Design a protein around this ligand. Structure first.
Ligand SMILES: CC(C)(COP(=O)(O)OP(=O)(O)OC[C@H]1O[C@@H](n2cnc3c(N)ncnc32)[C@H](O)[C@@H]1OP(=O)(O)O)[C@@H](O)C(=O)NCCC(=O)NCCS
Ligand SMILES: CC(C)(COP(=O)(O)OP(=O)(O)OC[C@H]1O[C@@H](n2cnc3c(N)ncnc32)[C@H](O)[C@@H]1OP(=O)(O)O)[C@@H](O)C(=O)NCCC(=O)NCCS
Ligand SMILES: CC(C)(COP(=O)(O)OP(=O)(O)OC[C@H]1O[C@@H](n2cnc3c(N)ncnc32)[C@H](O)[C@@H]1OP(=O)(O)O)[C@@H](O)C(=O)NCCC(=O)NCCS
Ligand SMILES: CC(C)(COP(=O)(O)OP(=O)(O)OC[C@H]1O[C@@H](n2cnc3c(N)ncnc32)[C@H](O)[C@@H]1OP(=O)(O)O)[C@@H](O)C(=O)NCCC(=O)NCCS
Ligand code: SF4
Ligand code: SF4
Ligand code: SF4
Ligand code: SF4
Lengths: 328, 328, 327, 326
């Protein structure tokens, strides 16, 4: 499974690629970058260092974010992208043409990847490079701690959106300068989890996450507003979750619509460092919400929300009782 | 998998159990039932015909809707249940003590069921009987046509809730007295589909339904309000879907909460008979929403919402292109 | 204005009518009532004590909750009403036919009411009696304290809805057995405040409440779910607000729809007694949301949400762009 | 009451200022502007034609969108603004320094304005100019008709937000090149209507609009999604309404938040021209929603939602109704 192979590639590397990250930051510093208008400077850097001409093309197809023409070294970027997104596109292409060898050797370090998986992993590492270039490690880590992890304020400072900030936060595993260890999740209204990235072993790092009581799936009921939750898994470990929906503009009233929820999760021990714990009492184990990973694999015994019987237990029927607890 | 076995049991019988339904209706008429306050009348019927004392009990555990004591023939019903729900509980018990043999032979018609499945199927048939007794077939079918399938108005007339009405609408397959053929779906915020029932073969009768563009998963974003949609599958068949959330009251601010979405679906050809098509243009194939059964088994080529690649194809990676269409 | 006259009538009486309340409770006790299935028992009491025959009529007009025919003493009640609501209707009629004189003298205690206002006040006092009969003071006050004011659990225990419980909670001003002093508000999506009741002087007891940052107006964004907020008025006083929407069933997809939000508010000092304070930090004056009574009468100086200029002040700056309207 | 004075100022002029609009368009064309990245080009224009240096400032206070320093001719623009918004700020300053006399004479055409109202109206005309420069009349009107008034698609093409597009749509009253006549509304969660603009006389042009059944107040229930409604007033006139909430980003989790709903309304006769009529049956007077201007002045007799009694109209101790103040 190509995308699952790459998910596991990043999971195995603690969602941190030291050489690549360093590389991005080095290039950011050596080439004189300054956060603020990074799109203009990335165009200039492409001109000066790779002979690549960046044009903002309002003639690209409606769905095309960028197209690179290697024969003339011409990078076309969609006019409808915001500066942060233009910067991301340009930095992705920069990874692919100017960091090709580093990415190739990083891919080689996992000899089990399939061919399709290797192509997908190249794209994933280029996206990682773009993130670590738009958000150079040191500056971003300092900003995240100074701002107490306010994702919106971080976006505002670095001119990027919610999802990108959450990506970068889940990558702060540089030895001796680590940020809060995070698990990053992306889902749609139907529960499809299309992105999993985690600094370390979490319950939802690879599978699971279909618990309707979990706040991430409640984001769509509160669109564009940040939701939060103190959650306890069936094994007693407790976690702090923040989430928010993200919507793709334009498209048109009739157009195809993009709707996702992005969630960030960490051990409850770290919650006190988040602006999102403001007003919440964290030391009270009785105010935690009991959630699970998905009913078929959830051993809780008195859940009123349970959707399916637990695959490990007895499905006893009682003809003489009516209960508000399904499959109890 | 017992609950899947029973799902397929009802699916194979076109979600209509002729013997049982008729039994219900007969008993409704022979014993003088009158729509309105069926809970009191069912208590009287239990007493007069089975010697069973129905008492309203506020001492039962919080989660108990009813408890039947066969040794003294005493049926205790939860005080916090509305009259329609009390009637449902009492009539479920009525099925189980007074229709035991009929239920057993109906189960016997499927010699492939496992033991657990046989018990679960008995409970399912008891629920079917309860529904067909609270909503006797002729009266309810006539009401459904008279009210143009307005689920709220049907509930008001028969003193029951949204979910029950939808249950009953999905069973009107009595030969020569058929209602609109429906597929009934129940989901949670996480997309777990816990109920599937269908008059005939529909796409989601047994599997699938994890398409984020399908309006059933959008019910939770518009809580307590009826949502509707003209949906088109990848094979061209068009359907009308109506859905609404249902919440279990009481429980308390800290208590466990029950939240589900219930959807009714039919061929687009039938939509014009629904009050829910009022104001909607049905003859315009361009105003239909293109949905799927779930990205991994969806062959659409330009879905902006796609969460996973379609397993029936391949998408080569293109290092030189950025798209708003995932897995193009 | 007739409805404002009666609003002020109840406001002046601290939203507690001692004689009437006591009356209800006595009647509840002397006639052997038991909380649970009060609708059946109220029908029995109407027959035994007033010769009033209660029929559940599925033939009433669609919008009629009840109609009383004094010539035959026949009380018709809508079949689509839940048992708690039927009980309420029956007890309203009970107030009007069996407590006529008490209500008349209570109204007489306010010589300023207009004639229309006196009629509206009779109906209001009958509703008060119905509330105090379905929810007898002693039992309900004890239950509220035991349940830490969980409105849903009170509704479950007494078989009534959110709005009725909140009504009754805001009336627990009986000397030597007081509940948390509350201000009761009902609004629609457009901000129209159609009900105001308060145990004591609150900011929104009589006027105001059009602040978009106030959580009550956010109830409609989170339908059927309880919303809560620690609010600070411009004068520094802090309050705890809980609110929830209430929707009228039936009616039909095309039918006329009723949607309201009901909010309960009290001084922050009392918040710790509410189940709704669970998980909330109450001692931190910095986590309070700064709201007002309505922009035109709100003196805050750096509100990004401000809708209109404050009437007490108004500078234009051709050389500046601000995210603060009417700085 | 300055803001009500300026509201009436624009209402009296059909929400179209012909001289200023033309000016904007001329300046757009004469200076070689091209739709797309107008913020950079407006910086260039400011420098070349008025000697004003536009700098992107991340040192301004958090609430300052721009500060112009007339003593050194330096316009500082907030870094957290999107390109359309930076362009809007720059064009506002351009109005105020380069169209000062035109704006002054336009204000002078209403000798009844108070002193404060004159300043507020100067700002209003500067904003009008910014809109008419970012969205040049001919080009924008053509785009609106081609795109069937898709507000999002118009925003995408011209690099601006929902509210700005709706603003511009409500001004297309240029003689012989008119767009759909619209009434533009902005409200908050509490029903406060802070903006009213109308091409012609509509019910809510100056007063009213507190009807809970009106779809504009339902936008917050469906945040960030376009809502639509076919509404009929108590006088029989029918209207098509579209609305959507708009939220101000940044600010922070604890920060002060800006939330508004912006609604566009037109006569039902025009609805068939809107993309938003797709899927709606428009000819069925029975599928129209009966709304009002606000209960105290609404004469409907069977509204279940009624909040206050109608001022133009008895208690019945023997009846209980689901229709308040019947
Ligand atoms: C999974 C995938 C197809 C999603 O495609 P998509 O839905 O079109 O969305 P994208 O991921 O391209 O971009 C969406 C947002 O994420 C951000 N983003 C993506 N990867 C990022 C990264 N590594 N660091 C920071 N931000 C990132 C983009 O900036 C964008 O922000 P925007 O919406 O404001 O422009 C795509 O991310 C991909 O191919 N990834 C390769 C790595 C991979 O397979 N990971 C598997 C994890 S389960
Ligand atoms: C699947 C199941 C465990 C769900 O349990 P639950 O979530 O606790 O909910 P219930 O279905 O018992 O009751 C919920 C509502 O559905 C209604 N309902 C349930 N079965 C019904 C039926 N056959 N006909 C009509 N209404 C029905 C109940 O009256 C109730 O209405 P209310 O909430 O307003 O009071 C349970 O329905 C069950 O055991 N069913 C029988 C087995 C079966 O059919 N399996 C096939 C699965 S597709
Ligand atoms: C204001 C008024 C017209 C509202 O009418 P309405 O919108 O038809 O709503 P009602 O008040 O009739 O009933 C709605 C709910 O409030 C409850 N309620 C009303 N008065 C109550 C009281 N005094 N105590 C407890 N509950 C009460 C009812 O039980 C009902 O609960 P339900 O929805 O579960 O059935 C009506 O309450 C009234 O006439 N009041 C008279 C007093 C008055 O004028 N108050 C002015 C306040 S500014
Ligand atoms: C209403 C007002 C006082 C304060 O408004 P505010 O809430 O602080 O915000 P602004 O109106 O300045 O800007 C909000 C949006 O409207 C847009 N906008 C404002 N005036 C506009 C116009 N004339 N044309 C087009 N777009 C306009 C801005 O571009 C901005 O878009 P953005 O959010 O993407 O950046 C101010 O707009 C004003 O000066 N109005 C004068 C005219 C008036 O009084 N009208 C009637 C009001 S009762
Ligand atoms: S059974 Fe477990 S996984 Fe399912 S809803 Fe309950 S807590 Fe969540
Ligand atoms: S790919 Fe298919 S299943 Fe997935 S969102 Fe698109 S239409 Fe729905
Ligand atoms: S100005 Fe006052 S009343 Fe208006 S939104 Fe701000 S705090 Fe609320
Ligand atoms: S009476 Fe009804 S229709 Fe008229 S304004 Fe009030 S809520 Fe709207």
């Amino acid at each position: 499974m190509p995308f699952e192979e790459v998910r596991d590639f990043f999971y195995d590397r603690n969602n941190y690629i030291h050489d690549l990250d360093m590389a991005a930051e080095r290039m950011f510093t050596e080439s004189g970058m300054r956060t603020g208008g990074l799109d203009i400077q990335l165009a200039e850097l492409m001109r000066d260092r790779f002979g690549i001409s960046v044009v903002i093309d309002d003639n690209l197809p409606d769905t095309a974010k960028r197209r690179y023409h290697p024969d003339t070294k011409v990078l076309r970027v969609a006019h409808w992208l915001m500066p942060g997104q233009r910067a991301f596109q340009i930095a992705t292409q920069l990874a692919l043409v100017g960091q090709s060898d580093l990415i190739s050797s990083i891919v080689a370090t996992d000899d089990q990847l399939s061919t399709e998986a290797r192509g997908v992993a190249r794209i994933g590492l280029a996206n990682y490079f773009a993130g670590a270039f738009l958000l150079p490690y040191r500056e971003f880590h300092r900003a995240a701690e100074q701002l107490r992890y306010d994702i919106d304020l971080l976006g505002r400072r670095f001119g990027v959106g919610f999802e990108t900030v959450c990506h970068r936060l889940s990558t702060l595993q540089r030895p001796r300068q680590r940020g809060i260890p995070f698990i990053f999740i992306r889902t749609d209204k139907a529960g499809n989890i299309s992105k999993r990235q985690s600094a370390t072993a979490f319950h939802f790092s690879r599978v699971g996450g279909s618990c309707p009581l979990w706040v991430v799936h409640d984001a769509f009921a509160q669109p564009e507003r940040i939701v939060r939750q103190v959650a306890q898994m069936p094994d007693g470990r407790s976690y702090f979750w923040v989430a928010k929906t993200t919507a793709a503009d334009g498209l048109g009233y009739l157009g195809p619509h993009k709707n996702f929820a992005v969630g960030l999760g960490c051990d409850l021990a770290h919650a006190h460092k988040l602006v999102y714990s403001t007003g919440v009492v964290l030391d009270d184990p009785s105010t935690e919400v009991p959630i699970g990973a998905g009913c078929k694999i959830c051993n809780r015994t008195s859940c009123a929300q349970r959707a399916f019987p637990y695959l490990g237990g007895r499905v006893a029927v009682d003809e003489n009782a009516g209960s508000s607890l399904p499959y109890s």
